[PDB]
Amino acid sequence: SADKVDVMIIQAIALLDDLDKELNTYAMRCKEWYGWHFPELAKIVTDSVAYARIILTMGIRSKASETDLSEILPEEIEERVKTAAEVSMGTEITQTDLDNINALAEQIVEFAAYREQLSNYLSARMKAIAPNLTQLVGELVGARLIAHSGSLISLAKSPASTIQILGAEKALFRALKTKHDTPKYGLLYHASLVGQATGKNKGKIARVLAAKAAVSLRYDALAEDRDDSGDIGLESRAKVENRLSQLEGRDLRTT
Amino acid sequence: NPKAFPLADAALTQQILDVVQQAANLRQLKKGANEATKTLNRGISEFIIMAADCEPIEILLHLPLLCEDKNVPYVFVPSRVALGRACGVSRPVIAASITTNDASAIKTQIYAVKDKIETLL
Amino acid sequence: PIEYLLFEEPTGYAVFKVKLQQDDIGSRLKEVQEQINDFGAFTKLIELVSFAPFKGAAEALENANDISEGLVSESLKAILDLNLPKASSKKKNITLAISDKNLGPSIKEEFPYVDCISNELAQDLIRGVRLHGEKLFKGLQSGDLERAQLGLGHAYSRAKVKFSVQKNDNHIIQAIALLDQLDKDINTFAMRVKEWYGWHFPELAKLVPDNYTFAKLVLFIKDKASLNDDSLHDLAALLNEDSGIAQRVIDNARISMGQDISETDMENVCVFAQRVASLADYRRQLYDYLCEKMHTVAPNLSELIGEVIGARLISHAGSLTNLSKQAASTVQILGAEKALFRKNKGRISRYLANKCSMASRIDNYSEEPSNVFGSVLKKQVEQRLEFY
Amino acid sequence: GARGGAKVVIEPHRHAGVYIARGKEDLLVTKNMAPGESVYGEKRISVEEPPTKVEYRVWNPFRSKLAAGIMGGLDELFIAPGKKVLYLGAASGTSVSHVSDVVGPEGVVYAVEFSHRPGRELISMAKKRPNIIPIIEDARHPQKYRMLIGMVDCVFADVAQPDQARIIALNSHMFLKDQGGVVISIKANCIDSTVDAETVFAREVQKLREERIKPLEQLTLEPYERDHCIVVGRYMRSGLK
RNA sequence: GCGAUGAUCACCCGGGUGGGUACAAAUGGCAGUCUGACAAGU
RNA sequence: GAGUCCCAUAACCUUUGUACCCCAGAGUGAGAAA
């Protein structure tokens, strides 16, 4: 089936990382290039997309007096940029310059729009190739796990211990050879469930979640007649949440 | 106002060219704008002499910026034709520099002109 | 005998009234020097009576220039008229303490009945107001004296330097970093369009190696199964049939091992291909802006070697000012890593470097550079060219 | 010596805001306010800090007389983080940029210059450094730019003029706080080349006392400069006795 | 019918070896994917 | 029980491919041509 081919996932996650790198570089320079005209914006508004949208709505500091930034910025942020506009140390630019800076800004929002589109595309792909895994670990971390092994089947044949420390080979094999303690989170650290845990419980939940991830993953890979529902993932998720609740309920301090 | 500034008067130009010629004999003179820039970079220049009728004058206007960043006296003489003749070469010279040397035979004359140029600036 | 004090703030003009007169003979004694520092003692000396803020940034610069030249602005004339009481020109005159003596004669002309004092006693009161600043204004809206100084400081400085955007060359430096960056990303994303559409129909990746040609064709041939004679003519219009690809695509579309991808997958390829199309279009637009901008900034350097080559030379130096200040030898090794200027071949390279250096100097230090000298300078290189 | 690929150890200097880069050779360095570019082509040192990439700029003693003072071992330097400094005779960013690094974002530097040609790059640099306020005006007439300067903790003067003592006194009286700092660079030749350097230095110190500035220490800038000295003083309005 | 606005200044048999800068790819190497039955409450 | 936190989403080495390079470098500084 065209909807159950995993090489799309490995390509999408690699592309998604590259898009984040490219969009960042263009944004830094739009801050520098337009910052020449108005250097105070970068300190006030840090978000790249919000920064770019300001250039589109208002081009020049003179326009700041009448232009409204309500939809882009809150009330307190929008007034600050207006005040900086008149006391700005920047120079004036020609409409020839303004046209190309707007052209750069339009590329920022277009890239931001498409990056959202790719993220939703990957979510749809992950929910059709491994619906059970997505329910437990999530679309983003799940996609990386598949990409790391290179194939869903390859990940399916790995034991739960490997999946726990899949992304931390550098620390693992250093520690193994030098007789020191090994990592306990790997790439799974960014799963939502691990975030909810605290203290030493994070290591325990990683062990519990990795064990259940292998259960839900193997069902995705090796099931001939899998329903695209994630039922195994949902019930697997409930067990880990119950484990977290009783794990987090306990208090070490004597009461 | 004019880009070439200060421009030495007739009395001062005559004195400046005297030092330039004696420096040429004693191998204490570097000729040409490219040489003048190098000496400024090495910080081995007593002062810089430039021609005010260089065509265009802008091809030597970098030297004043280098000089007054480095606090080196500089002065413009009206004629590149005369400056080249004093330098001892058979071509016009637009810029020249007097090399730093505390063991030179013409120390007193050089410092005599350098004090005058400083007053002019 | 001081009765009023004038203080000029970046936000506006402030007038104070002297309640007590500090000791004159004992002015140099330590205790009278300390009371200037102590706010509890100082507040017994003076009190704020009036404050007239400037309307905006433009007015502040105008009055700063007037104050710099010892002139009375229309704003200053208004505040003094409102506050200072009328007195005789001869019998008795209101005394005003001002920081600048050059401003004294100007105030006298506008107001014959006010006498300006700028002796050391006045300076001490001015020093105290400057020391305590906003604390003496009793909460009156003076904005922030530290931010206004920074804006007014840049404004006042550049006005004297006549700093202009025409001289600006940083636009050139950024656009180079865009152009090569766009080329890398266009090539990078274009290649990814090959693989994604390579899965669906690999043979096309062989047919039209030109990268920009795939996307427009992939935008058209979304599904290889769709093969119509009219579509063949439509894709035949794309590029030319001289290569024969228009027939090959129809044939290979009928016979290929490519696995069909989902509708959502194709939606990404065309959209991702569409993004690459925009960047190439934007890159061409920017490259034209560079050609125009360079002619404005460095016409001599641009004409001698070219707009793009000169821009890369400017960026390597870091600024047109840096390139001008470099010697002839340094410029040659500045472009010796990318072969910008490239035994007889080297001699032309060294010769062109010297000419490029002079061209930069004319461009850098001229308010409105012309291309007259760059043209003849290139011609001089052209005469050198055939000789060797 | 200090080549590209070599690695160095950065440790703090006795003066706040100044650092030492150890190795086969020691380098005086300052943390870069505007990372990623050099204002006058100095070497730069990058450290990966948890990771953000911080940068440090090498301070060349042979180019900046203030750096020569730090090398020579000045006991007290009023230039420190979070202080306002009035820099007189700011030809360009060779020394002002380093001073801007020491004061840091919280501090400010009022760069004063007269010649328009060096001023233009002073503007160009200052737009990279938000804490620098370039004042293209003669230091001989502080009344012209009184609007632009508030009270300053320290006054640094590198003006090479024969009557710089008058320039220092006027600026200190208007803008320097009581008990504030004064750091002067004196070149014997510019003031009076007729007499020896020592007579000039003794004469300038007397002028500073007359203007209610107490000299604290004196240092000569050899081997970095000849017939140069830095005088560090405190502005004691109340009394020097 | 010149010039300081700048003169002058690796190897082997037409062919093959040696060295250098930049970028891309490798299902090429380093390189080998932690432990395994108790824990928490009254 | 157990180092995510030294980017295995990586660095370095090797092979292959593409495009350029074999003069000095803070280059030198009055010769060249006859």
Curated annotation (Swiss-Prot), chain A:
Crosslinked residue numbers (Glycyl lysine isopeptide (Lys-Gly) (interchain with G-Cter in ubiquitin)): K127
Similarity remark: Belongs to the NOP5/NOP56 family.
GO CC terms, sorted: 90S preribosome; box C/D methylation guide snoRNP complex; nucleolus; nucleoplasm; small-subunit processome
Protein name: Nucleolar protein 58
Keywords, in A-Z order: Coiled coil, Isopeptide bond, Nucleus, Ribonucleoprotein, Ribosome biogenesis, rRNA processing, Ubl conjugation
Encoding gene per record: NOP58
Principal location class: nucleus
Other known facts: Present with 34700 molecules/cell in log phase SD medium.
Organism in which the protein naturally occurs: Saccharomyces cerevisiae (strain ATCC 204508 / S288c) (Baker's yeast)
Single biological process term from Gene Ontology: snoRNA guided rRNA 2'-O-methylation
From Swiss-Prot, chain B:
InterPro entries recorded: eL8/uL1-like (IPR050257), H/ACA_rnp_Nhp2-like (IPR002415), Ribosomal_eL30-like_sf (IPR029064), Ribosomal_eL8-like_CS (IPR004037), Ribosomal_eL8/eL30/eS12/Gad45 (IPR004038), Ribosomal_eL8/Nhp2 (IPR018492)
Record's subcellular location: Nucleus, Nucleolus
Cross-referenced PROSITE patterns: RIBOSOMAL_L7AE (PS01082)
Keywords: mRNA processing, mRNA splicing, Nucleus, Ribonucleoprotein, Ribosome biogenesis, RNA-binding, rRNA processing, Spliceosome
A GO cellular component annotation in the UniProt record: nucleus
One term of GO molecular function: U3 snoRNA binding
Family classification: Belongs to the eukaryotic ribosomal protein eL8 family.
Protein's name in the database: 13 kDa ribonucleoprotein-associated protein
Organism: Saccharomyces cerevisiae (strain ATCC 204508 / S288c) (Baker's yeast)
Swiss-Prot record, chain C:
Consequence of substituting V331A: Reduced growth rate at all temperatures
Keyword field contains Phosphoprotein: yes
Transmembrane parts of this sequence: none
Keyword Transferase: no
GO molecular function: mRNA binding; snoRNA binding
Keywords: Nucleus, Phosphoprotein, Ribonucleoprotein, Ribosome biogenesis
A biological process from GO: box C/D sno(s)RNA 3'-end processing
Phosphoserine modifications at: S319
Record's GO cellular component terms: 90S preribosome; box C/D methylation guide snoRNP complex; nucleolus; nucleoplasm; nucleus; small-subunit processome
Location(s) in or outside the cell: Nucleus, Nucleolus
Domain Nop stretches: 297-388
Family listed: Belongs to the NOP5/NOP56 family.
Additional remark text: Present with 13500 molecules/cell in log phase SD medium.
Assembly notes: Interacts with NOP1 and NOP58. Component of the ribosomal small subunit (SSU) processome composed of at least 40 protein subunits and snoRNA U3.
Role played: Required for 60S ribosomal subunit synthesis.
The name this protein goes by in its record: Nucleolar protein 56
Organism: Saccharomyces cerevisiae (strain ATCC 204508 / S288c)
Gene: NOP56
Full protein stretch here: 3 to 415 of 504
Curated annotation (Swiss-Prot), chain D:
Enzyme class, UniProt record, top EC level: transferase
Chain residue ranges for the region called S-adenosyl-L-methionine binding: 94-95, 113-114, 138-139, 158-161
GO BP term (any one): box C/D sno(s)RNA 3'-end processing
Modified residues (Asymmetric dimethylarginine): R3
Positions where Omega-N-methylarginine occurs in the chain: R3
EC number of the protein: 2.1.1.-
Location (main, coarse): nucleus
Localization of this protein: Nucleus, Nucleolus
This protein's UniProt keywords: Isopeptide bond, Methylation, Methyltransferase, Nucleus, Ribonucleoprotein, Ribosome biogenesis, RNA-binding, rRNA processing, S-adenosyl-L-methionine, Transferase, Ubl conjugation
Record field: catalytic activity: L-glutaminyl-[histone H2A] + S-adenosyl-L-methionine = N(5)-methyl-L-glutaminyl-[histone H2A] + S-adenosyl-L-homocysteine + H(+); a ribonucleotide in rRNA + S-adenosyl-L-methionine = a 2'-O-methylribonucleotide in rRNA + S-adenosyl-L-homocysteine + H(+)
GO cellular component, one term: box C/D methylation guide snoRNP complex
Effect of P134S: In nop1.3; thermosensitive allele showing a decrease in histone-glutamine N-methyltransferase activity upon shift to restrictive temperature
Per UniProt, location of the Glycyl lysine isopeptide (Lys-Gly) (interchain with G-Cter in ubiquitin) cross-link in this chain: K65
Source taxon at top rank: Eukaryota
PTM comment, free text: Methylated by HMT1, forming asymmetric dimethylarginines (DMA) within a domain referred to as an RGG box, made up of repeated Gly-Gly dipeptides interspersed with Arg and aromatic residues.
Region of interest called Helical, as start-end residue ranges on this chain: 196-228
Keyword Ion transport: no
Family of this protein: Belongs to the methyltransferase superfamily. Fibrillarin family.
Name of the protein in its database record: rRNA 2'-O-methyltransferase fibrillarin
Native source species: Saccharomyces cerevisiae (strain ATCC 204508 / S288c)
